[PDB]
């Protein structure tokens, strides 16, 4: 395994790399980083070139200045240039949380770049808007996104050793036994090196806080209403931030889809239940 950088779209992104062959590109979300995919890097690097990006603003990736540097079009072009720049015309794209927000959008816009899509807990462009409009449990669960618009939130997250971030990821992870002391160490270092301003900047371009914005069909603008490539969802049913109903009626938007629901996993199945997750990924990849 190696740690490398690539210059794309006006920024230098740090990434973890292992293996050779076809590209399996992993995109984390908030407030994780490339390390969340460690169990998949290990498992799939004998048959694939496994690459896990630190998204712009995160860990050792560059932290470009201003909200405009974290807009969906910019993030989407990042991914396109990573695939090309690493010498590929297509990949298997594996996404979670904010990375799914971006990855889903990228897939709809650039299906030819995506051989197969594997998505963990996170917003599907169309169904998420539907659940914001209809589901009081989702509305509640997603209230933090409105709060994140506030200039006080950065202090909240950084206060006293990233207390805010520890609440989200470390405390649950330690209780349940899937983060070792070294994992906690890696996460803390990632927050020291990363930028909480950059991490929050993603959220500050979101257009889902207005009665008529909530009326938009998709989280981010899309001309494409159907995604026709093979897709696998791997979903932790206990996720407090995304309700199970995000998956209802998804076939309308993604006709060739397979869904695997984990009854005993929450927001991040990939490192909560890596063994079960990996076998489902193999099954899908080999279908």
Q: What's the CA gap between 57 and 48, in Å, rounded?
A: 27
Q: What's the CA gap between 78 and 131, in Å, rounded?
A: 28
Which tokens hold the place of 106? 């990228």
Tell me the torsion sign for CA atoms 236, 161, 15, 19.
negative
DSSP state of 151: T
Q: What's the CA gap between 237 and 269, in Å, rounded?
A: 9
Cβ(100)–Cβ(93) under 8 Å? no
Q: What's the CA gap between 70 and 72, in Å, rounded?
A: 7
CB atoms near residue 281 (< 10 Å): 22
CA angle (221, 226, 232) in 5-degree steps: 105
Q: What's the CA gap between 275 and 222, in Å, rounded?
A: 35
Total of domains in the chain? 1
Cα dist from 180 to 40, 188, 209, 271, whole Å: 17, 12, 38, 11
Tell me the torsion sign for CA atoms 72, 105, 267, 93.
negative
In 3-state terms, what secondary structure has residue 234?
strand
Contacts of 32 (CB under 8 A, 6+ apart): 96, 97, 169, 187, 268
Per annotation, catalytic residue among 49, 96, 124, 267: 267
CA angle (94, 273, 35) in 5-degree steps: 55
Closest CA to 29 of 120, 118, 114, 108: 120
Measure CA of the first residue to CA of the last residue in the chain; give whole Å. 28
Cross-sheet strand order for the sheet of 49-53: 2-8, 11-18, 49-53, 23-27, 91-95, 114-119, 231-236, 257-262
Residue listed under structure tokens 């933090």: 144
Closest CA to 116 of 227, 40, 230, 26: 230
Verify whether residue 182 is a known catalytic residue: no
Per annotation, catalytic residue among 32, 78, 97, 239: 97
Residue 87: φ, ψ to 5°: 95, 20
> What radius of gyration, in Å, describes the C-alpha atoms of the chain?
18
Q: What's the CA gap between 61 and 5, in Å, rounded?
A: 8
Closest CA to 199 of 81, 51, 29: 29
Percentages (nearest 5) of helix, strand, coil residues in the chain: 45, 15, 35
CB atoms near residue 6 (< 10 Å): 18
Verify whether residue 267 is a known catalytic residue: yes
CATH number of the domain to which 166 belongs: 3.40.50.1820
Per annotation, catalytic residue among 203, 239, 253, 271: 203
Counted residue by residue, the chain has a size of: 287
Q: What's the CA gap between 229 and 239, in Å, rounded?
A: 26
Residue listed under structure tokens 């917003």: 123
Q: What's the CA gap between 180 and 187, in Å, rounded?
A: 11
Q: What's the CA gap between 97 and 85, in Å, rounded?
A: 24
Verify whether residue 54 is a known catalytic residue: no
The residue range of the domain holding 268 is 1-287
């Amino acid at each position: 395994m190696s740690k490398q950088y690539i210059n794309v779209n006006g920024v230098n992104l740090h990434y973890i790399s292992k293996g050779q062959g076809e590209l399996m590109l992993f995109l984390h979300g908030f407030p994780d980083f490339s390390h969340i995919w460690r169990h998949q890097i290990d498992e799939f690097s004998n048959d694939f070139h496994t690459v896990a990006l630190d998204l712009r603003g995160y860990n050792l990736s560059e932290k470009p200045s201003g909200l405009e540097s974290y807009e969906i079009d910019v993030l989407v072009e990042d991914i396109r240039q990573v695939i090309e720049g690493l010498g590929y015309s297509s990949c298997t794209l594996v996404v979670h949380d904010w990375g799914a927000g971006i990855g889903w959008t990228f897939a709809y816009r650039y299906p030819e770049y995506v051989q197969k899509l594997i998505a963990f807990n996170g917003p599907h462009p169309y169904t998420f808007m539907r659940e914001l409009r209809t589901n009081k449990n989702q509305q509640k669960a997603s209230e933090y996104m409105k709060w994140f618009q506030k200039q006080e939130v950065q202090d909240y997250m950084e206060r006293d050793n990233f207390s805010g971030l520890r609440k989200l990821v470390i405390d649950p992870g330690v209780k349940k036994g899937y983060l070792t002391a070294d994992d906690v160490q890696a996460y803390m270092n990632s927050w020291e090196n990363g930028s909480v301003l950059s991490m929050l900047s993603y959220y500050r371009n979101l257009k889902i806080f207005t009665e008529e914005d909530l009326r938009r069909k998709s989280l981010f603008p899309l001309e494409e209403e159907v995604l026709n490539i093979p897709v696998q969802i791997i979903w932790g049913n206990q996720d407090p931030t995304f309700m199970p109903e995000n998956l209802d009626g998804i076939e309308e938007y993604v006709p060739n889809i397979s869904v695997h629901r984990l009854a005993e996993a929450s927001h991040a199945p990939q490192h909560e239940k890596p063994q079960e997750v990996n076998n489902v990924m193999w099954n899908f990849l080999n279908k």
